[PDB]
Structure 1
Amino acid sequence: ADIQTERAYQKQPTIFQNKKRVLLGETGKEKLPRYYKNIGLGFKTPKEAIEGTYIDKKCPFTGNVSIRGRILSGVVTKMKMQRTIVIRRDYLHYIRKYNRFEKRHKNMSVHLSPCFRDVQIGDIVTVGECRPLSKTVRFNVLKVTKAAGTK
């Protein structure tokens, strides 16, 4: 998978990839070291992020983002943007005059890392709050759980 598709050169800023190498240690390529971080709160780092090659500065595991504040869950409704998806959060709002609830929802645009592959319309995503990534995106997908009847 070629990772150079923009006008600029895509690269993890922390990793230095031009270290001098003698010809005796030139067994193909050096297998460019991968930068990854362990986000806390008991979330495992996907093996894809560790062993991947994608460049994503908004990735919670390989990019420059900090998970802080609220951790929420939603259902994936649309995946038509690049590296970001639209999830749906449903809830019941109480009305005190009638002592009864009404069904409400709100969509949320959340950044989805390339480390989560095979995400389908319908699965559950645990997202975590971060700094503003775009005009409307303030959350990053931290965990993906499949639907109840997946193959």
Structure 2
Amino acid sequence: MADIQTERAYQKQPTIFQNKKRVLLGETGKEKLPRYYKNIGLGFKTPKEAIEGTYIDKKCPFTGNVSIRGRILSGVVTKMKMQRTIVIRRDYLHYIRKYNRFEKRHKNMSVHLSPCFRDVQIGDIVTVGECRPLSKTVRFNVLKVTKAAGTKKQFQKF
């Protein structure tokens, strides 16, 4: 937060300016930064954690430029071992009409994950949404994380 730079360049949000008006705070006060966020719409809600916290990322939709428009999908976490993204999976069933049986098939996809969510673990349900391309194999972003399935992450007393 007090360090968010490690680059060879300065990191900041667009649509923010630093005024040089008035002078009198005493000790400390306004961190000289109002926060930027926006609504996503479609019944999805911005996290409190985004508005509270400090990160500079342009590829998350709660802060940076990128819309969610078109499709909405789900998935599940399978792996995370990359920075500001994850890998996910989609289990589904393919039918054959000669037989009357189904069979299992899965694909894997990457998708970008905001620094807002940091409570992710491998095995959580995840929700995603169609976006403009961000990268070669990223076309999506997260909208929501949830856990509501068998063998939960922490003991029942919630």
Q: What TM-score comes out, normalization by structure 1 length?
A: 0.91
Number of matched residues?
150
- Counterpart of 1:115? 116
Cα distance in 2, alignment partners of residues 58 and 147 from structure 1? 27
Cα distance in 2, alignment partners of residues 109 and 98 from structure 1? 33
Cα distance in 1, alignment partners of residues 131 and 51 from structure 2? 21
The secondary structure found in structure 2 opposite 1:49 is helix
Q: CA deviation at 1:31?
A: 5.0
The secondary structure found in structure 2 opposite 1:83 is coil
Cα distance in 2, alignment partners of residues 24 and 80 from structure 1? 44
The secondary structure found in structure 1 opposite 2:25 is helix
Cα distance in 2, alignment partners of residues 2 and 119 from structure 1? 23
Which stretch of the first structure deviates more once superposed, 118-127 or 13-22?
Answer: 13-22
Cα distance in 1, alignment partners of residues 46 and 14 from structure 2? 19
Structure 1 65/19 Cα, relative in aligned 2: closer, same or farther at 3 Å? farther
- Counterpart of 1:4? 5
Cα distance in 1, alignment partners of residues 36 and 42 from structure 2? 20
Cα distance in 2, alignment partners of residues 24 and 105 from structure 1? 58
Q: CA deviation at 1:65?
A: 0.5
State the identity as a percent.
Answer: 100
Q: Map Cα deviations across residues 91-146 of structure 1 (whole Å, 9 max, x no partner).
A: 00111110211111111100000111110000011001101000000010110002
Structure 1 24/54 Cα, relative in aligned 2: closer, same or farther at 3 Å? closer
Contact 2:77 2:87 in 1 (8 A): yes
Q: Map Cα deviations across residues 57-111 of structure 1 (whole Å, 9 max, x no partner).
A: 0011001010011111011111111110000011001111102111111111000
Structure 1 118/57 Cα, relative in aligned 2: closer, same or farther at 3 Å? same
Contact 2:57 2:63 in 1 (8 A): yes
Where structure 1 has 5 or more consecutive residues not aligned to the other structure, the ranges are: none
The secondary structure found in structure 1 opposite 2:106 is strand
- Counterpart of 1:39? 40
Q: What TM-score comes out, normalization by structure 2 length?
A: 0.87
**RMSD, matched Cα:** 1.8
Q: CA deviation at 1:7?
A: 1.0
The secondary structure found in structure 2 opposite 1:86 is strand
Q: CA deviation at 1:40?
A: 1.0
Cα distance in 1, alignment partners of residues 137 and 20 from structure 2? 39
Contact 1:75 1:123 in 2 (8 A): yes
Cα distance in 1, alignment partners of residues 113 and 150 from structure 2? 22
Where structure 2 has 5 or more consecutive residues not aligned to the other structure, the ranges are: 152-158
Cα distance in 2, alignment partners of residues 129 and 65 from structure 1? 10
